[PDB]
Amino acid sequence: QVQLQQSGPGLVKPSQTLSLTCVISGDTVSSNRAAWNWIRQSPSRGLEWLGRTYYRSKWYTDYAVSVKSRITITPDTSKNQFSLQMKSVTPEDTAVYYCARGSAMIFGIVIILESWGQGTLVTVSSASTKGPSVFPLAPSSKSTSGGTAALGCLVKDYFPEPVTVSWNSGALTSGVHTFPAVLQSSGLYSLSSVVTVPSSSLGTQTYICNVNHKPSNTKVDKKVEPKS
Amino acid sequence: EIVLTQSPGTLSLSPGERATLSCRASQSVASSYLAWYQQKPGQAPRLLIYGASSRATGVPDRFSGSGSGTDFILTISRLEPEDFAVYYCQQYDGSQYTFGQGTKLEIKRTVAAPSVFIFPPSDEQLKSGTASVVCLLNNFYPREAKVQWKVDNALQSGNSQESVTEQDSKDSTYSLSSTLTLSKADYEKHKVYACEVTHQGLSSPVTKSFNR
């Protein structure tokens, strides 16, 4: 039962150094049965393995040719973690980065990436962090369709990705659509999160969108009241 | 550097059908060193088949892998709706791991007409000098849809942005937002804001509009 916890989404300026850490629960970083890998994913890199470190009476490393001269991967036995550092980042280093454990699954030889962290989006950009404004998408006669009523929150003008939107502190999940962000002409992102609910519930039930922008540490709860 | 390449790029199949995914390698790969991964939206890749033909722990029996040398095949003998994902093949040469670019599996589904909703700008946003008008097309299939903004019957261009959701887990439908952004001064110069929706599931095009 290994659990890999990665650092939060981050912004790194071009030509500076990317830094990410993977904390291991359910295994030991010095285990002689595992290797500890980093992988990234983006439209231009595809699914790209970056390197690994592992302990076998001494610490070893292997790096992918694509990044061999730019990365280190360093374990930390005092905190049971391993980190990825990548110097001189370019926009092509913008990606979701994953940590992953490699285990010998086919007679002692084949090291297979069998447990993965949840992924960390790293944006390479010179622009500053900005928290979002949250506006209500109020339900009305214009946002009904039969007995169903739609409502949402417009999460506007933030940077960088991502934001997370829940409804009623996670108790409301059915019929929720949170759209992919669009980059606005200002260079700031925007998205809406919508949910459909019974139109009969608008007078009695409370609907609150909970907006979290970890890069700015912005938490916003927005009570969406109907307007007619 | 062994390049792995998957076919097709996108596959659209109905639940209950057999999916056959190819992975062909630039050079011979020992079958012990080829694996398949499944990636569902917002999640990390997950190990499906290892050693070309062995099911990982917990993987259902409808997933199987075969092949040897240069040609490898992942088969889903009877698709379930939850099998919507991207599938990657992967190889390891002892020192480097490479992946295919992936095959996207779309779940085919009965045509579904969109539910159309429109939202005027909130009073709070308008007090800040901006007006965002949102047209919502909810739970439709197939993905293709046409949305047209009219302001006082004037067809609008270059002032709206569309965003489309991934295939919904519960019903394999898509949803789409079209957002018209104006300055507060621009917004208050007009009266009728209208969103017009065209989609093959609809008998005739649907317009949602409001007066300021």
Cβ burial A188-219 (10 Å sphere, 16+ → b, else e): bbbbbbbbbbebeebeeeebebbbbbebbebe
Tokens of A224: 């969406």
Rounded distance between C-alpha atoms, residue A172 and residue A116, angstroms: 28
**A192 interaction partners in chain B (CB closer than 8 Å):** 134, 136, 163, 177, 179
**Within this chain, do residues A95 and A153 fall inside the same structural domain, yes or no?**
no
Would strands B146-151 and B4-7 be described as parallel, antiparallel, or unpaired?
Answer: unpaired
**B170 interaction partners in chain A (CB closer than 8 Å):** 174
Rounded distance between C-alpha atoms, residue B127 and residue A100, angstroms: 48
DSSP secondary structure of A85-140: EE-S--GGG-EEEEEEEEEEEETTTEEEEEEE---EEEEE-SSPPBPPEEEEE---
Write the DSSP symbol of residue A168. G
Rounded distance between C-alpha atoms, residue A71 and residue A50, angstroms: 8
CB contact under 8 A, A192 and B134: yes
| Residue whose C-alpha is closest to residue A124's, from A11, A5, A28 | A11
- Kindly report the CATH number assigned to the domain that includes residue A203: 2.60.40.10
3.60.20.10, 3.40.50.1370, 2.60.40.10, 3.40.630.10: which CATH number matches B1-109?
2.60.40.10
Rounded distance between C-alpha atoms, residue B71 and residue B75, angstroms: 13
Question: Is B180 in contact with B132 (CB distance < 8 Å)?
Answer: yes
**Within this chain, do residues A16 and A117 fall inside the same structural domain, yes or no?**
yes
| Residue whose C-alpha is closest to residue A8's, from A215, A226, A227, A224 | A215
| Residue whose C-alpha is closest to residue B135's, from B118, B147, B112 | B118
Residues of chain B with CATH 2.60.40.10: 1-109, 110-212
Of the candidates A106, A156, A177, which has its C-beta nearest B50's C-beta? A106
Of the candidates A37, A39, A106, which has its C-beta nearest B51's C-beta? A106
Q: Which amino acid is at B133?
A: V
Question: What's the per-residue H, E or C state across chain B?
Answer: CCCEEEECCEEEECCCCCEEEEEEEEEEECHHHEEEEEECCCCCCEEEEECCCEECCCCCCCEEEEEEEEEEEEEECCCCHHHCEEEEEEEECCCCEEECCCEEEEECCCCECCEEEEECCCHHHHHCCEEEEEEEEEEEECCCCEEEEEECCEECCCCEEEEECCCCCCCCCEEEEEEEEEEHHHHCCCCEEEEEEECCCCCCCEEEEEEC
Q: Which amino acid is at A46?
A: G
**B96 interaction partners in chain A (CB closer than 8 Å):** 49, 62, 64-65
CB contact under 8 A, B122 and A137: yes
Of the candidates A114, A136, A179, which has its C-beta nearest B122's C-beta? A136
Would strands A148-158 and A144-145 be described as parallel, antiparallel, or unpaired?
Answer: antiparallel
**A173 interaction partners in chain B (CB closer than 8 Å):** none
**A48 interaction partners in chain B (CB closer than 8 Å):** 99
**Within this chain, do residues A18 and A102 fall inside the same structural domain, yes or no?**
yes
| Number of compact structural domains in chain A | 2
All residues at 6 or more sequence positions from B174 whose CB lies less than 8 Å from its CB, including other chains? B139, B140, B141, B142, B143, B145, B164, B165, B166, B167, B168
Give me the long-range contacts of A175-178 (CB less than 8 A, separation at least 24).
A177/B138, A177/B165, A177/B168, A177/B175, A178/B165
**Within this chain, do residues A43 and A14 fall inside the same structural domain, yes or no?**
yes
Return phi, psi of residue A91, to 5°. -55, -25
**Within this chain, do residues A173 and A83 fall inside the same structural domain, yes or no?**
no
Tokens of A93: 């280093």
**Within this chain, do residues A27 and A115 fall inside the same structural domain, yes or no?**
yes
DSSP-derived 3-state class of residue A170: helix
Record the resolution, in angstroms. Answer: 1.9
Tokens of A139: 């339900």
* Cis bond upstream, residue A162 (ω within 30): yes
For residue B116, the distance in angstroms to the closest alpha carbon of chain A comes to 7
Q: Rounded to a whole number, what is the largest CA-CA distance in chain B?
A: 69
Residue after which a domain boundary falls, among A106, A126, A146 = A126
**Within this chain, do residues A119 and A154 fall inside the same structural domain, yes or no?**
no
| Residue whose C-alpha is closest to residue B161's, from B144, B174, B178 | B178
Residue after which a domain boundary falls, among A89, A105, A126 = A126
Question: Is B134 in contact with B185 (CB distance < 8 Å)?
Answer: no
Of the candidates B43, B132, B210, which has its C-beta nearest A154's C-beta? B132
**B1 interaction partners in chain A (CB closer than 8 Å):** 65
Question: Is B206 in contact with B197 (CB distance < 8 Å)?
Answer: yes
Write the DSSP symbol of residue A159. B
Cβ burial A117-148 (10 Å sphere, 16+ → b, else e): bebbbbbbbeeeebbbbbbbbbbbebbbbeeb
| Residue whose C-alpha is closest to residue A71's, from A9, A137, A114, A17 | A17
Q: Which residue of B has its CA nearest to A44?
A: B101
* Cis bond upstream, residue B8 (ω within 30): yes
**Within this chain, do residues A112 and A179 fall inside the same structural domain, yes or no?**
no
The class (CATH top level) of B110-212 is mainly beta
Q: Which helix (H) or strand (E) holds A187?
A: none
Domain range for A166 is: 127-225
Instruction: State whether residue A147 sits within 8 Å of chain B by CB.
Output: no
